C-alpha cells in the first residue's frame, strides 16, 4: 500500500557487536541489519545488497566498521507476492565517515 | 527504624561531615566540580 518511503540511517554496530565471538562478528552484523530494517520499516523480510555485504566484510570477519550509513528503502513486493506486500531493501552509502549524521528522508523521483 | 535502644558509645556519636566526594564514579575521577576541572586544565579546543 502506501509508505513506499526510503530513508537514510546510521546504525551503531559497535554497541551491537560488543563482546561477540570473532568468527561471528561479520555474520552477526548481517543479522543486525535485517533486525534494524524490520524495526524502522516494519517489514518481516529484508533484502541486503551484495555490495552492502562487501561493506560489512571489507576488513574481514572481525573488522566490522563501528558505524555504517544505510539507505533503507521500502518497496512493493512482486513475483508471486508472499504474505508481506512490502519488503525492505538496504543499500550502503558512500561517505567519508559515518559518524555525526542524522536520519533523513530521501525524496522520490 | 531501629527495633531497640542502643547507646553502645558508638550509636550516640554526633557525626558532622567535613567533605563529600563528588568525583566521577565512571572512572578514576580527578575533579569534584566542572569549575574545578576548568581551573586545573585551563582552556581547551572545545571551548571558544
Amino acid at each position: 500500500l502506501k509508505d513506499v518511503v526510503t530513508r537514510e540511517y546510521t546504525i551503531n554496530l559497535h554497541k551491537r557487536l560488543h563482546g561477540v565471538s570473532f568468527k561471528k562478528r561479520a555474520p552477526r552484523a548481517v543479522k543486525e541489519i535485517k533486525k534494524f530494517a524490520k524495526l524502522h520499516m516494519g517489514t518481516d523480510d529484508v533484502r541486503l545488497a551484495p555490495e552492502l555485504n562487501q561493506a560489512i566484510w571489507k576488513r574481514g570477519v572481525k573488522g566490522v566498521e563501528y558505524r555504517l550509513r544505510l539507505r533503507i528503502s521500502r518497496k512493493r513486493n512482486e513475483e508471486e507476492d508472499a504474505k508481506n506486500p512490502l519488503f525492505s531493501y538496504v543499500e550502503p552509502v558512500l561517505v567519508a565517515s559515518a559518524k555525526g549524521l542524522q536520519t533523513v528522508v530521501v525524496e522520490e523521483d | 527504624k531501629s527495633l531497640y535502644t542502643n547507646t553502645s558509645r558508638k550509636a550516640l556519636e554526633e557525626v558532622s561531615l567535613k567533605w563529600i566526594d563528588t568525583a566521577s564514579k565512571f572512572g578514576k575521577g580527578r575533579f569534584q566540580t566542572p569549575a574545578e576541572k576548568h581551573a586545573f586544565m585551563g582552556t581547551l579546543k572545545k571551548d571558544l
Binding site: - | 558508638k10 554526633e14 563529600i20 566526594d21 563528588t22 564514579k25
Partner: protein, 48 residues
C-alpha cells in the same frame, strides 16, 4: 542510588584516631516524599 566517599572527624575518647580525620564509605538512598493513600486496621486474634 550508589556509593560515595565521606571525610569526617572521628570523635571517640580512648582511640588512636580521636579528633583526627577518617575517610569513610557511605551509600546514598534516593527518597522523595511518599503519598499516603489508604489505611488498614488489624484485629488481634488467637490465630495472629
Amino acid at each position: 542510588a550508589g556509593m560515595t566517599t565521606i571525610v569526617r572527624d572521628l570523635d571517640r575518647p580512648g582511640s588512636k584516631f580521636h579528633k583526627r580525620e577518617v575517610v569513610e564509605a557511605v551509600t546514598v538512598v534516593d527518597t522523595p516524599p511518599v503519598v499516603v493513600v489508604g489505611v488498614v486496621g488489624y484485629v488481634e486474634t488467637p490465630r495472629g
